[PDB]
Amino acid sequence: GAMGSMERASLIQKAKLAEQAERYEDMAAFMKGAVEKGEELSCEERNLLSVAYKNVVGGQRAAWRVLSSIEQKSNEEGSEEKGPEVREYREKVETELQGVCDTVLGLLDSHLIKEAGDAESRVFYLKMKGDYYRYLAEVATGDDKKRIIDSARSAYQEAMDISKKEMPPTNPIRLGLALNFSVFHYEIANSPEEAISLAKTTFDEAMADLHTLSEDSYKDSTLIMQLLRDNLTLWT
Amino acid sequence: GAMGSMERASLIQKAKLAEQAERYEDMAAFMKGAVEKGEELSCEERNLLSVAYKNVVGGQRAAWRVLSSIEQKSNEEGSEEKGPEVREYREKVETELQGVCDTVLGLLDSHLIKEAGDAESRVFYLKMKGDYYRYLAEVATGDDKKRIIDSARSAYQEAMDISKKEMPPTNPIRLGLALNFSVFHYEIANSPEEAISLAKTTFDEAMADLHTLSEDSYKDSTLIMQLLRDNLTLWT
Amino acid sequence: FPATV
Amino acid sequence: FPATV
Numbered sequence A, B: 001g002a003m004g005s006m007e008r009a010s011l012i013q014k015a016k017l018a019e020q021a022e023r024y025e026d027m028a029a030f031m032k033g034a035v036e037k038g039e040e041l042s043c044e045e046r047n048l049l050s051v052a053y054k055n056v057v058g059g060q061r062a063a064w065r066v067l068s069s070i071e072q073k074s075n076e077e078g079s080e081e082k083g084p085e086v087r088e089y090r091e092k093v094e095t096e097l098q099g100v101c102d103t104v105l106g107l108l109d110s111h112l113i114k115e116a117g118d119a120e121s122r123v124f125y126l127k128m129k130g131d132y133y134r135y136l137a138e139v140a141t142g143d144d145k146k147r148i149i150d151s152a153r154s155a156y157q158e159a160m161d162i163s164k165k166e167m168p169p170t171n172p173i174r175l176g177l178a179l180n181f182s183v184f185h186y187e188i189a190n191s192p193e194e195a196i197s198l199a200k201t202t203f204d205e206a207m208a209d210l211h212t213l214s215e216d217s218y219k220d221s222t223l224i225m226q227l228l229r230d231n232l233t234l235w236t
Numbered sequence C, D: 001f002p003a004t005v
């Protein structure tokens, strides 16, 4: 690792600096280096890791979607043959995206998940595992597409099972997990009814638990609840 | 060059795709590959090259400014020693910025400028040379700072001399050159009066030539004129 | 595109 | 920061 000679604390400090500078590729590289020190991550560190790679892959996904749309248009009946270039460049971005997802999944498998025993860490990492298999599923087309989808489903399901046993319904990790698993159902699994049911049940169970919360926790939970409602409005 | 095996036309096509996907590092790499084919660039191709690297270095400059500001604050009397990390990471971004500028300057020197005989190409490239020495000057602090500033000045001045001889006062390249040279005077050369005089004279001479223009050319020229006015408003 | 976090 | 193009 190019970060192997840097102190763990220095890597975390630089990840925070990279975030302020909106240098998310650097942020992800720093946080990868921190993970590879082998120690468990704190709550703040887990979120630094997630923010970094979410921003990197989010940009890749946005670019892939633009290029896929151009490619599909170039292949419609009536278009001018524009050569292999659009496909080639879409493939290049796709391969880079898959590489980032494989990197994150590799960090989770070696060895973040196996050492994560507390609900807040284990659910967080299993949600990430579901998320990065979901991004792989968004671009998958071959012999392994079904297996990628099932890997996302399985990770999300284990996270859900733990979250329902160990966290209150307003816990923001539980809410964000359900938000994303609901999107998985809608966009990946072709299961819009499951997506809607999950979002609605999650929202209602959180609503009924808000009375237990401080003002700051209320803000955290209701922000994610609004995203659930936003998706339900999109879908119904 | 990693692009040496790709067709020139394919590189240009992919630069355009990268632009649509907001993948400006890729765009710059494609356009570097196109330049390195050794043929002169068309007007469209020159602008693809400029857009790509302007976006790349613009992001680097923005990040450098954030990090420099954090570093200066960490060094004020009363701060908590935060170790070498802020300086190290600012230096890393700075070195990457300098590398991008050196790359662009290298393309201009090998061999875009020496083959550029038409005013529209030669002024454009000399403006770029001034711009990328200006970005180097923004971060320069050592034995060569004065020489970097004079290299920017000299490139801008040769571009100005050609533009005044060979282009009308409303030509958008001439206007954009004067806009940027005026900023060089204000921000780099500590010559605010020169910056203001140049912006004002450029604006007034363009105003008096607008009557010669088509509706589309008028739009192009007045857009840059508005930027001159915007800067004059900032500065007076 | 739907919201995720 | 001033405008450049």
Ligand SMILES: N=C(N)c1cc(-c2cccc(NC(=O)C3(Nc4ccc(Cl)cc4)CCNCC3)c2)cs1
Binding pocket: A019, A043, A044, A047, A048, A051, A124, A127, A172, A173, A175, A176, A177, A223, A224, C005
């Ligand atoms: N960016 C940094 N430097 C740091 C961030 C945190 C942190 C630590 C804990 C929680 C958060 N909440 C978030 O990020 C947001 N909610 C969220 C909820 C569930 C999940 Cl599973 C993921 C996200 C993201 C979307 N809008 C609302 C806040 C952030 C510590 S440091």
Ligand SMILES: N=C(N)c1cc(-c2cccc(NC(=O)C3(Nc4ccc(Cl)cc4)CCNCC3)c2)cs1
Binding pocket: B019, B043, B044, B047, B048, B051, B124, B127, B172, B173, B175, B176, B177, B223, B224, D005
């Ligand atoms: N992005 C692409 N794919 C392509 C762009 C062009 C092109 C070709 C010619 C001119 C432009 N004008 C510009 O870009 C803008 N003016 C400008 C003026 C002087 C300079 Cl020296 C530089 C810029 C940039 C700022 N706002 C107004 C337009 C663009 C051909 S292709």
Ligand SMILES: [Mg+2]
Binding pocket: A007, A008
């Ligand atoms: Mg150590």
Ligand SMILES: [Mg+2]
Binding pocket: A091, A094, A095
């Ligand atoms: Mg592929």
Ligand SMILES: [Mg+2]
Binding pocket: none
């Ligand atoms: Mg259920």
Ligand SMILES: [Mg+2]
Binding pocket: B007, B008
């Ligand atoms: Mg050829």
Ligand SMILES: [Mg+2]
Binding pocket: B091, B094, B095
């Ligand atoms: Mg330096």
Ligand SMILES: [Mg+2]
Binding pocket: none
């Ligand atoms: Mg003068």
